[PDB]
Symmetry: D3
């Protein structure tokens, strides 16, 4: 079973499109899903091999039940809201996700145009973010973002559904959150204080050692080991976005994993805290304004419709 | 002696256009920023040399000029003139400062825009912010190659930079901006041959239609002007696509630089008001202007001294 | 595995196709060159890593096979079969050896071709030499993107490489070549919408025309065949433009690789002989085949051991 | 005043040389094409920026100049003069127009050549068409780096562009072309040391042989000329390999630009006819000229009218 | 797989080779660093993706192995064995740890080397540090292309990586290093043809000399070994030039990886000790080895768990 | 101009600095080499155009100028002056000739350096040889962006090239070199905020600290000097990191070019001797100068003519 392009090369541009399916829109949607791979080739092939255009399509829980019948992915549910003492992770509507990536924005925009052209009148846009790599893989807080992502076989094993849910092997679960940062507040910290929030050094991206890294740093709370001692990992492809006029500086978070349990555990630790940590310090400078969960099927599941 | 801003830029694949108004009381903050904007361009850009190709051209409008400076005004500076054609209208919208930021990548544009606006918050109000990108092989949203007949090298220097005619402001230029939104559904209902008739060139190969066959209300026909002496009058354009798929906005951000606005304004009159043989530029049947402003972009040394 | 030749190449922008026949007495010289051709590919190409992307696929025809080797023949190897259609003909021309040389620049191709022909001088007679070049947006001589639907990765391995069905020759492939000359004047008299109807895809955007609108005598319609499996039958193509402006020759060099010739031969029957609903492939109204040959491209290890 | 044609071009790895004669009656068609060839160059080349580096230099021969124009002639314009040397001969062959088309890739060259010949069909007859390719380390067909001592910047402007000495035609240049075919088997039978003695420079490192060991009949010896005041007389060359393996043609297409043909012609006389010290240029013992033509390449403004 | 280190790297144009010994008492510090060396490679290299191509391969010597680790030893690990030939000698020099750091640019190599040595200061003593750079056409200091016949893809995986013959260490490899200094004055007194006879390949075109002309004491002749197997025994080399023009040092840093040291050691014996028809490798008449060590480069996973 | 040497070079990422003394008897060898150094630069560089960007700038010291040439001296040419400050000292070390070799890759640098020193064998004695590499965002060894405020374009020509003040030597420049070694352990114990106060710019963003917070003893404060008119006096710098990890050498090789050495010497006096308001440049608390020389780099025409 061929997976979608969840494991992509590093790409410098992305469009994230989240839509809801209008009443009556189900058939239009199904026809599009069966064509999305061929549109990806048509737009992408003439810019090979530099273009690295790919589109990962995801389907939400309530939408899955309107479109298909029979067996469902084992872990597919609506994003679970987290009501922490201080910080909250909201859930927002989203039936379909298009995660469109390439080495240039225009390829992204051309593919998005074709997809929404086929869907006009069946869907309603909920979110559209045009993302860009910032410098040397930095995010909007000025830290390198991506460094501890798994690679190669460790990545395939962390992100692709296997034997545990055989009918959906080759699929993945994507969680999306749009975050806005309070840059004024962040920039009032010293660099050393910022490093204590993230858990790594700013200029060199070296992890802080275990004897200085705080329990409420981001890296501390998103490190999770499983009952057998192995690391529980996700694949992230966070993108900066913003608008200077509106003072909007953002990180669009997207995390892929073989089951939503992994991602959800990390989220609980960040928002709700642990025995030793009230919450992830990064949330004192970052507000989530969207939250959705999607299942990204194997490519063959979409071809056969 | 005088160093121009980077009006004549290499081809760049990302741009930010920022148009603001100066609030009451903001003038001093703005003047400090103008004198530092070249420094900020170096601070952001130098670490990404030589690939980055970051430049910022700063432009000042007619009313803002009188609030900011006294003494001489550049000879051609006035407010953008609204054009009320029989069918199509070129609006004038508010604009005191233009920052036309270009680079080979968006992040550098954004980083410089962030630094500029960081110094100016409290003193200005944003009116328009567009993030532009190059689309394929220099194509615009209508699917045609865009820029082909721009002047280059010495001809560009001569068409764009103020010289002896206004010696206090030699090295400056005049910029006209209009944000255009396209009706892509209408446009895509035309055959390719019909689209070529609107533009005046071939779509795939970008070869100009012969005199034999080019309509008089084609875009290329209307924007070709020879001056009293018989030589052509040229501008320098760096149009950028922009858009949002969910809102159905597909746009062209027009910016044209010229040594005097009279050239740009004549082209605009022809397009909106027509000629004896052409009611209006057919491109306007698929393109609506929603902003319009005119700025003077001084020589770099003018700004350095404040 | 055994190591296949570089049938599955990265995208390359230049090629040389060489077709020769083996003269009387030439077999020994040929067999020496075959055993060294991989090391000549590395000699010429290694110093130009990693941009060079130079490869050479060597193929052997049916008659030549029996002069060169004894023991088993590959299952599918036979002379190219002439197709005498009502209107269009697929001709057969002589060819014992194919060198399909690809790289990112012509000079590398030429350098390797020079070395190969150097070793063969006086053993072979050239029948065809074509210097091909890809247009800058993967377009062909007709102006359409060419390559889009080729299979990739595991699907390509499955469609192209001989496997368990003929185990002594696993890792090999079958190559069909035809040189096509186009009538560019005729083709350029069609509208874009008409040309799209001949091909089956949009010219500018390369999106496939939908099933409800794509004519049955369009190229894409006729070269889509499903097997008994239900699954599509695929080939791997690497068509290359060529020509000469002084002689008015504008051409497409077709080369198609498949795990058995039955796939390629079916497509050719459909194009040249037609189906229940289509007289012939409309592309042949603008394209004439003037060569036709079929080769087996053995696994690299087969050649190394001689 | 005058914008020259793109005589001083960036390094380009591909070229098409097209030489045609103007048929009886063809003069008007030619004139119309000349006035448009700059705009064809932009049409084909602009969309391939900035990599494409497409340019076309157009040149006109002496007899054709008389058919096309009246009024002033360029001072230096005359038909190529045959050299009948004791051993080697430089032939003169017909040609009224030259298109010297250059780019980073052959297809751009071909696209522009196609447009040009399309407009000239029926008015001209092709005499020569060569598709050139530079080897990857600026080597020529003989394996030597080719172009090392070309002038650059202001030295090149001084050497190639007509100035105040012929002010009606300032910004123009004179092009000489010769197609050479090589005897590769003879050449490859020389040791490297013997080859270096023919050329005048070291083969692998491209360092010039010192004055005390460079032969008098080496190529570099004979093509170094000083003028009355003792300064070097210089040309700009853009020699391209070409060939066909099937027909055993291995060639160098010579093109030299100079502000007057006297410089190029003197170098040619030294090569073909000899000096007191040297019977002839040793490179001609491996190279035969099979065309020879001379053209004036006007300032681009001259063609715009 | 277990995950190997990046033994099979893309082509890289810079390297640092660092050889250190472990001071007594330093073993715990070293074990900590080995468990973090992969994360340091990512911290330094991630921000420079994808062009940076920084990798670090870490190798452990025989005696160090015994001081550092509990369990079983790799089967092939021993001290480098001195070779005392009639004319030329391969010396064995001290080395407990090898860091073979490669990238597209020296700065990344240096930055990683700095971080590694930062953690080791006080626990190790530097024995050798070489900053290598590739000549622009993959040439070495003798002017010959270097790397041409290395194995590729699956053939490389098979020649370099320990498999089920030593299953606890599958995914490891064995590295041999020797620093060579050349007598450039002597070498440059040879004609090109005589140099070609020492190496066994053509200097300009890198084509192998034919079997009837290639000397038996040529480098290529001596380092071509067939196994008991019938077939070729291969190693993977990544030789780097280095030097200092003031000191007249012009060098080649030899590094060879193999799945067992037997292969590399055979080649070395042939070079230094000779064969029936060759006294020794002629290259050694212009090259003096001044270091020599052997290391085991474990699988990535082995190091992660310490 | 007469044609200057390549003092104004593009950004390059590698360099070799070679400083030598002329031995007795060496004068004529040196003179021959000077007249050929441009042609060596082309021989090594041409075949790697235009990616290579190889240049060599050749400079001559005061004492050596008198040995080599008769006739006029450059007005500004004198031995580097030692500065014996209360705390820090700028040493003067011997040097007759400087070769400042720059390119995009080290191997081109090394190849040209090899040719130059090969011609000078036996006539000169090497005093200093440094191989420099740029860190990947134009950062130096202290982690700051280095080069931001260098002049460009006509401002650079005006700052660095001799003109009509010394018309015989128009086109020349004056280069000062100093090799510095850094105390990295001390530097890394400062907070980033404290480092910024040493340099005078922000570390991450490279923005200049504002006049109200920048300390008087910061590097930027002390190296800003205004001339009689109130304009900035500028130099052109191309500082290069270098180092050796095993020897714990981390260095900055300083090279500054100016039209007269008075400008560079003023800056050095301020840094090392201090002013009324600054004891000395705080960068010297982390940087020790171990060489110091001054050279005149003539116009290229001057070297051709002999
Ligand atoms: C709010 C915006 C976010 C920002 C700006 C951000 C930023 C960062 C940065 C700079 C790192 C260190 C470098 C790296 O390894 O990539 C990192 C690591 C990580 N983040 Fe986040 N992050 C955000 C949200 C999240 C969320 C919501 C999750 C999980 C649900 C998450 C999971 C991770 C994980 C798993 C790691 C790697 C930890 C390890 O070293 O083992 N991040 N993030
Ligand atoms: C006469 C010159 C030829 C030209 C100029 C040409 C051009 C094209 C073009 C433009 C496409 C559509 C884009 C793509 O998927 O590549 C295409 C598709 C194809 N062509 Fe051709 N073609 C030629 C001859 C042939 C021949 C002789 C064959 C088979 C023997 C063939 C087999 C195919 C196949 C199999 C496809 C893709 C079908 C699918 O869409 O699933 N072509 N060709
Ligand atoms: C001074 C040291 C060395 C230099 C300058 C050098 C240079 C070269 C050159 C120029 C080639 C031919 C091109 C190629 O295939 O890469 C080559 C091949 C080779 N060298 Fe070396 N080499 C050196 C040391 C060694 C050593 C010490 C070994 C073995 C322990 C070795 C093993 C080989 C092998 C296996 C080949 C490939 C032979 C084949 O199958 O063609 N080299 N070397
Ligand atoms: C250890 C030696 C050095 C280091 C690591 C160093 C580093 C730097 C850095 C980081 C900057 C700020 C960015 C820039 O504009 O380049 C700078 C500026 C500067 N440095 Fe240095 N520097 C060194 C030595 C010197 C010396 C010895 C001089 C003068 C003789 C000098 C002259 C300058 C000048 C003129 C500026 C720019 C001032 C203006 O900002 O308008 N540097 N240096
Ligand atoms: Mg705020
Ligand atoms: Mg002190
Ligand atoms: O993250
Ligand atoms: O500096």
């Amino acid at each position: 079973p061929e997976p979608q392009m969840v494991l992509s090369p590093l790409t410098s541009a992305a469009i994230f499109l989240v839509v809801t399916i209008d009443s009556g829109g189900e058939d239009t949607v199904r026809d599009l899903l069966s064509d999305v791979a061929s549109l990806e080739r048509a737009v992408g092939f003439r810019a090979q091999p530099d273009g690295r255009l790919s589109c990962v399509t995801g389907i939400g829980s309530e939408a899955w039940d309107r479109l298909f019948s029979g067996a469902r992915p084992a872990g597919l549910h609506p994003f679970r809201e987290l009501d922490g003492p201080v910080h909250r992770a909201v859930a927002t509507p989203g039936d379909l996700l298009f995660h469109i990536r390439a080495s240039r924005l225009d390829l992204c925009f051309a593919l998005a145009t074709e997809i929404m052209g086929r869907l006009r009148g069946a869907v309603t846009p909920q979110d559209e973010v045009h993302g860009f790599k910032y410098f040397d893989e930095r995010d909007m807080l000025g830290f390198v973002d991506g460094t501890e992502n798994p690679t190669g076989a460790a990545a395939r094993r962390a992100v692709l559904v296997g034997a545990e849910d055989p009918a959906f092997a080759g699929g993945s679960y994507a969680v999306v959150q749009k975050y806005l940062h309070d840059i004024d507040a962040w920039e009032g910290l010293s660099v050393e204080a910022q490093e204590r929030v993230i858990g790594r050094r700013k200029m060199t991206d070296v992890e802080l050692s275990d004897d200085v890294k705080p329990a409420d740093s981001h890296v501390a709370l998103t490190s999770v080991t499983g009952p057998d001692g192995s690391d529980l990992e996700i694949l992230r492809d966070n993108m900066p976005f913003g608008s200077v006029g509106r003072e909007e500086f953002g990180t669009y978070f997207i995390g892929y994993a073989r089951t939503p349990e992994v991602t959800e555990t990390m989220l609980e630790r960040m928002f709700l805290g642990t025995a030793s940590a009230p919450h992830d310090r990064i949330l004192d400078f970052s507000t989530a304004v969207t939250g959705s969960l999607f299942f990204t099927p194997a490519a063959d599941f979409l071809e056969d419709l």
